[PDB]
Structure formats: structure tokens, C-alpha cells
Amino acid sequence: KEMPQPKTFGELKNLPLLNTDKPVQALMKIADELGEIFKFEAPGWVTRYLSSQRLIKEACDESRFDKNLWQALKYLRDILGDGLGSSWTHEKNWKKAHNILLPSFSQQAMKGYHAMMVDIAVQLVQKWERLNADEHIEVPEDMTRLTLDTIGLCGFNYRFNSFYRDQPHPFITSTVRALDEAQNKQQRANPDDPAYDENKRQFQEDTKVMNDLVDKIIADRKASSDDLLTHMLNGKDPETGEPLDDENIRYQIITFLIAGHETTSGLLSFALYFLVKNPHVLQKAAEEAARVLVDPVPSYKQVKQLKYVGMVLNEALRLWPTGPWFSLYAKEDTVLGGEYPLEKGDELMVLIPQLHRDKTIWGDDVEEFRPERFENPSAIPQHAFKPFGNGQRACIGQQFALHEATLVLGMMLKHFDFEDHTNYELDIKETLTLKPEGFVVKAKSKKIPL
Ligand code: HEM
Ligand SMILES: C[C@]12CC[C@H]3[C@@H](CCC4=CC(=O)CC[C@@]43C)[C@@H]1CC[C@@H]2O
């Protein structure tokens, strides 16, 4: 009945427990101690963190709970406005943009993106083919080169040309710094203190970087396509008959450029990490890649046939879902789990990595990397596996991400053997989205021509 809560610090309430650069990992440790639900209060906000499938299945009932803008997401509205992921479900532009953009993620759209995804994937493989003997690969850095370029090209017919730069693209640097600031601002007792004026200035500078790139993309399109940008500019919502206005279009462009790259780069990076730490799994995945990818360019159908590679990616998303949060609020008063009364408006936060370690669902070996868990996906209980969120606010990009990641990981496993040459110790960096910081490998080419 009474809800668990970690210790408080006077008027700071629970906030000092989140003074860390790894908040999801810190909150997982609180869930370890307190169980499937605990309340957390800051001077500015209150939420309840959920970790069990039993309770999360209830939170995913859209007749009782709607998507909530949790604190860091509210901060991102300064950049993303009422773009798709940062709008309330009841905000006019959510359903409008959802209706206008959903056909850009049809299976037919995916088939149309395939050749562009191959273009960027081939650039990754060629970069690695061209390294010298004394070199290694910076894995998340190169995955982010690939995933930013892929959403640029597929979504906007724009080439970031990230493989032509040996430093991250400036859009990446500004994305990391802005999302890091949204993460950190949550932990500040007094965010309007002038101590944080320099953080505000930098956040505005990163916002201007993003908006300058949006201007270039828009100018490029004028000076040149059936893609996301086409639908932003020309589509009409079939419900309201209305188009997106120019202000919301700008928010959507930034929205898709950010969301289209970071979680997918983290996934590819974690997937490669788990493969080199589990060589027998790597061998099985590499065997599938060689058996299926018989042509120099993978076809759309061949990527759909990479079943074990798909299982590898799902299992990586099980252990470290790379956007590890989604938040709900109670639409009306209701009792959660038969035990915890909630009031209309009360916030819930789904701790996805902890959901994915629910032993009553997965068994006791929750920490083992075992892609065979996903051999028969219909055998996984409803709402036990939620790396893409829930309901009408689930990830619109889920099929895009998985097709890109399956294609790229398949080509990687076809073209190289991998060495964990530093015996890398997993260090998970959090800037809202997760990545294995510092993960490096050496690739030995299998000498298979493109
Ligand atoms: C493995 C990669 C990905 C993961 C783990 C992921 C995860 C998520 C999650 C958890 C949400 C729900 C957030 C919430 O409820 O507050 C979401 C929403 C979203 N994702 Fe992704 N995502 C991935 C890839 C992508 C890609 C490639 C795109 C774009 C092409 C994308 C665009 C979006 C957008 C626009 C939303 C908001 C949807 C809406 O509210 O209408 N994501 N994603
Ligand atoms: C806001 C957004 C959907 C929610 C994303 C956000 C990028 C950062 C992010 C990381 C997470 O760990 C949870 C999901 C969030 C909070 C995405 C940027 C554009 C998309 O609309």
C-alpha cells in the first residue's frame, strides 16, 4: 500500500540522490534496493519509477495513462517545440504531424530507403577496409557517422558527409552538449541561479548550430525527392485537412535529425560490444551474414532474412535500450497494481533497462547476452520488451532503426573479423541516450569485395 521511497535530504527531498552523470544506472540501483516501484521527489517535480512488467503493463493502458513530458523532455522543448516526440498527445500538432509523417515509415517507404542506407553502409565498410595495420576503430564515433548520414540522406536528401571528417560533425557535438544540458538541468535545485548562465548561453549556441543546419537543408531542397522533408512541406493531415506550418516544420527537422541518429548508433555499438564479449554468439551471427549476404550489395529481401542478426539487436536492446526512459501520467484517478492509488496527473517513469531485467519474465539469467531469447518473438509476454516505448506514442522510427542496424551489422560481420584488443571495460555514458563510451576494436578484413 505505502509506496517505497529513498531517503530525503530536507528541502532537497530526493534530488541529491541523482547528482551523477549516470542517472539511469543510479536509478536502477535504487530499484534494486526498493523494488518494482518507488516514489522520487525533487523540489520541482515528483515521479514514480516503475520496473516490473506487472506494473508497466498497466501503465501502458492508454485508456488510463497518456505520455508525459518528463523534466528533461520539457527542457528539450526549448529546441524541439511541439515536434513529434516533445509534444503532448493532446497538442494539435502531435496528431497532425503523426498523420502527415507516418507514411514516411511504411514498409514501402523502407524499401525506398534501402539503397540510400546501403550507400552509407558501404562508406563505413570502405573506411574500415582502408585503415592501416597500426590503427583501430572508435566504434560509437563511426556508428554515429553512419547513423547521422543515413537519416540525412534518407530523410532529407542531404549529405552530412560524416566519413569525410575526422572529428564529429558539429551537429553531433551540439546534439550531445544540448542533451547533456537537459539531463544535467534536472539535477539542479535552483536552475535559474546565475551559476548556470554559461550553461544557458552554451545551450542557445547549440540551438543556433541546429537551426543553421535546418536552414541549409531547407535551402538545399529549394535548390534541387519523396522523403520526410517532402511530406513536411507538401503533406496535408487527412483529418484536419491542414499542413504543418513553417515553425513546426523546423521543429520536426531537428527532431528527426536528432532522434534518427543517436539511439541507433548506441544500439549498433552495444551490439558489437556484446558480440566481441561473446565470441560464440559473434560466430553464429557471422555465419548467418555469410550465408545470407551472397551478393556484393545486400538486397532489401536479404536484410529481412538476417533473423539471427535481428535477434542480436533485440537482445542488445533488452540489456541496454538506448533511449532508456518513457514517462506516463494518470489520465484520471486510478489504483496501480491494486495497491498504489494514483491521482489524476500523477507521473510515472518506466525504467526500461530494469523492466528488461524482470526475472519473473526472463528467468534468472537476465544479465546473460543470449539472442536465442528472441528466437520466437510471439513467446515474449505483452509489454515485457519496450525499447521503443508504447502505444500511439511509440517510436515512429522503430522499423527504420532496425532495418538500418540489421543491414549494417550484417555487412560488418560479413566483411571483418573483430578483436577486443584492449579488453574493453564497459563504461556507459548517459546523455539521455546510452552508449558504450570509449569502445574500440580492431577489424581484420575478410577481403570480400564490395
Ligand atoms: C534503436 C533505435 C531507437 C530507439 C531505442 C528508440 C526509442 C524510442 C522511444 C523509447 C520512444 C518513446 C519516447 C517517449 O515515450 O517519450 C521513441 C519515440 C520516437 N522516436 Fe525513436 N528510437 C529509435 C530510433 C529512432 C529513429 C531511427 C527515429 C527516426 C527516424 C526515431 C524517431 C522517434 C520519434 C520522432 C519519436 C516520437 C514519436 C511520437 O511521439 O509520435 N527513433 N523512440
Ligand atoms: C524528443 C524526441 C523523442 C524523445 C527522445 C529525444 C532524444 C533523447 C531521448 C532519450 C531517451 O533516453 C529517451 C527518449 C528521448 C527523450 C527525441 C529527440 C526528438 C524526438 O521527438
Word description of this protein:
- By secondary structure, the chain is an alpha+beta fold.
- The chain has one domain: Cytochrome p450 (Orthogonal Bundle), CATH 1.10.630.
- It has a 5-stranded mixed beta sheet, with helices on both faces. Strands 4-12-9 form a 3-stranded antiparallel beta sheet. The chain has a two-stranded antiparallel sheet with strand order 6-7.
- A hairpin with a 4-residue loop joins strand 1 and strand 2.
- The site of testosterone has 16 residues, from helix 3 and helix 10.
- It is classed as oxidoreductase.
Characteristics:
450 residues; alpha+beta; Cytochrome p450; five-stranded mixed sheet; three-stranded antiparallel sheet; 48% helix; 11% strand; globular; binds protoporphyrin IX containing FE; binds testosterone; oxidoreductase; P450-BM3 mutant
> Termini separation (Å)?
62 Å
Secondary-structure element series: HEEHEHHHEHHHHHHHHHEEEEHHHEEEE
As for the number of domains, it is: 1
Rg over C-alpha atoms, rounded to the nearest angstrom:
22 Å
Small molecules bound in the structure, each named once: protoporphyrin IX containing FE, testosterone
Give the second-level CATH assignment, the architecture: Orthogonal Bundle
Number of helices: 17
Report the biggest beta sheet as strand number plus sense, adding barrel if it closes.
5 strands, mixed
According to CATH, what is the topology?
Answer: Cytochrome p450
Strand neighbour order, sheet with most strands = 1-2-8-5-3
Basic shape = globular
PDB class: oxidoreductase
Keywords: testosterone, oxidoreductase
Assembly: monomeric
Entry title: The crystal structure of the BM3 mutant LG-23 in complex with testosterone
